[PDB]
Ligand binder design. Structure first.
Ligand SMILES: O=C1Cc2ccccc2N1
Ligand SMILES: O=C1Cc2ccccc2N1
Ligand SMILES: [Cl-]
Ligand SMILES: [Cl-]
Lengths: 340, 340
């Protein structure tokens, strides 16, 4: 076929990272659908081909696995589905309506990639071992693969949500961080109450440095923020409950939302007994987090996707702090795409 | 001369990292002076030669500087001073008394190496620039150089202090961490009061997980702990005072000392306005911390010297947490020497 020819071609192009502003401009009006089509029919093959080229550069012991080949088959099909529109005409509303339908299919085709790539890590550990060099190479590849996957789904979500026929697709220009915190907590609480018959309470404190007592808002993707906060709450609650099983006091989970000139930082503090430093440094490893999971490493990728970060600092015997670092300004919020 | 011949010889040996137990065994009695002499007259040339060999592997633009050559001259002289005792007899008390006197001279000869190596970094920045690749290479070398320097001074201090003619040299087998915290604070307070005419107050809280309300003790080098806590207090006070100049409230500096099964963690929390993440990641860089300083990067080396760490997590607009990670058990407290 021509799949190898198409990967090599678009592999020569570099992905074009977009800013929050550019995302808001693309979603400003439904009339923009044409510019989004002409941009995505070139950008999506470029991002797909770039990661598809790195997949083919993996060692043959990884490249010949059924998991990598299954995912590579999805990417080849997705690439070909998008390349059909390269010659079509943007002015034909059927060309655009078909593109939107083709993106939704591509998105659903890749819905089960995270657990599939997680099966590959487990297969590797049992077929070749869990050495540190394998950890760094798996970590390096998966971080870049998943980050690419986040970027592609972001592009697809922005087009399919806005051009469907206050919120700009998946972006909330006035995202109230404390409200997303509460939502993520309420969901973790429900699960914690169902499993442990007890849940820690929530305390939130905001620190708007420049405008005290003004609610902290930002331009961000609330779904991404929810995912990070939901994973952290699940860990903080699990630790808080299991560490106080022999006690009556169930210490609360405290969340500080701080807004500075550059950073919007969200710290989650628990008293769930803490974790030795030796293990904290392994909670972000795909291989060590795999067992016969990836919430934290992927959560950190969501934070990094827009020039943020996610860091953990524990105190064995007391508790653990988790901090989501985000860019406070939409001008500094730019896609972090893997460097190919 | 034979200095190049001696470096190459002892460079083939690997440094022998010692544990807290081994340090306590060497200092158990003054009678041990012979075993310490026979060990140090081989180990000190090995550690000196190993770092001296890496110095000679630096690029000629760094190796030909007056700072690197001045320090290399001190190391060559120190190496030669120690090699004089290789053939001498341990049973002669004059051979031992001369060794002790020779170690003190070597220690004082290298007293001004940190500021000298800091002058070299400044010279490099102005002669060749402050690029990221230069930062990583300078960071890599200085971290290993200073860590080696800490290890050598530790060996010398343990011999000269114990074999001078409750505390085992520089090691306190029952180091009360909160007392060292108070000492470091009281010194930073004095300086802060002298310079700013105002100082934050101190609050300490201990969390002895296994034995609640029992004071937290450990086997450690209190001088090293003081240095780390003193640097952190100076930063936390500077930020706390300068960030509240237009205010009346001067928030306190809060310190938690937590003791777990594996870690003894010390967190210093201030409300000095915080620092953007972009800059926190540069506070441990020698090059970016150099200006026409190294307290934090060296403090982290002291923490790592016995398998610990020092980490900073800030929240721009609020404050900053600094955590010293130490090993709680003397069995896990082992020298971290550079890997040559
Ligand atoms: O004990 C723990 C481990 C952890 C990871 C992430 C968030 C909170 C916590 N608490
Ligand atoms: O603002 C700051 C920066 C810093 C470094 C180390 C310790 C405390 C602080 N506070
Ligand atoms: Cl995917
Ligand atoms: Cl030195």
């Amino acid at each position: 076929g021509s799949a190898p020819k198409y990967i090599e071609h678009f592999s020569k192009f570099s992905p074009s990272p977009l800013s929050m502003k550019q995302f808001l401009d693309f979603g400003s009006s439904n009339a923009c659908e044409k510019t989004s089509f002409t941009f995505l029919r070139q950008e999506l093959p470029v991002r797909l081909a770039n990661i598809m080229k790195e997949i083919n550069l993996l060692p043959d012991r990884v490249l010949s696995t059924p998991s990598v080949q299954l995912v590579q088959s999805w990417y080849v099909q997705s690439l070909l589905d998008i390349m059909e529109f390269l010659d079509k005409d943007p002015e034909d509303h059927r060309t655009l309506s078909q593109f939107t339908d083709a993106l939704v299919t591509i998105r659903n085709r890749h819905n089960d990639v995270v657990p599939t790539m997680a099966q590959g890590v487990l297969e590797y550990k049992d077929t070749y071992g869990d050495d540190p060099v394998s950890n760094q190479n798996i970590q390096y590849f998966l971080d870049r693969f998943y980050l690419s996957r986040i970027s592609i789904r972001m592009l697809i979500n922005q087009h399919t949500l806005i051009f469907d026929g206050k919120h700009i697709g998946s972006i909330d220009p006035n995202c109230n961080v404390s409200e997303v915190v509460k939502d993520a907590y309420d969901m973790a609480k429900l699960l914690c109450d169902k499993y442990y018959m007890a849940s820690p309470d929530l305390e939130i404190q905001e620190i708007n440095a420049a405008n005290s007592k003004q609610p902290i808002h930002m331009v961000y993707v609330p779904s991404h923020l929810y995912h990070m906060l939901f994973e952290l709450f699940k860990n903080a609650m699990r630790a808080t409950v299991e560490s106080h099983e022999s006690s009556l006091i169930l210490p609360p989970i405290k969340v500080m939302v701080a807004l500075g000139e550059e950073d919007l930082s969200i710290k989650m503090s628990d008293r769930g007994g803490g974790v030795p430093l030796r293990k904290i440094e392994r909670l972000f490893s795909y291989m060590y987090s795999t067992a016969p999971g990836y919430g934290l490493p992927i959560s950190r990728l969501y934070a990094k996707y827009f020039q943020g970060d996610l860091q953990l600092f524990s105190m064995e015997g007391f508790g653990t702090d988790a901090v989501i670092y985000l860019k406070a300004l939409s001008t500094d919020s730019v896609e972090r795409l893997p460097v190919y």
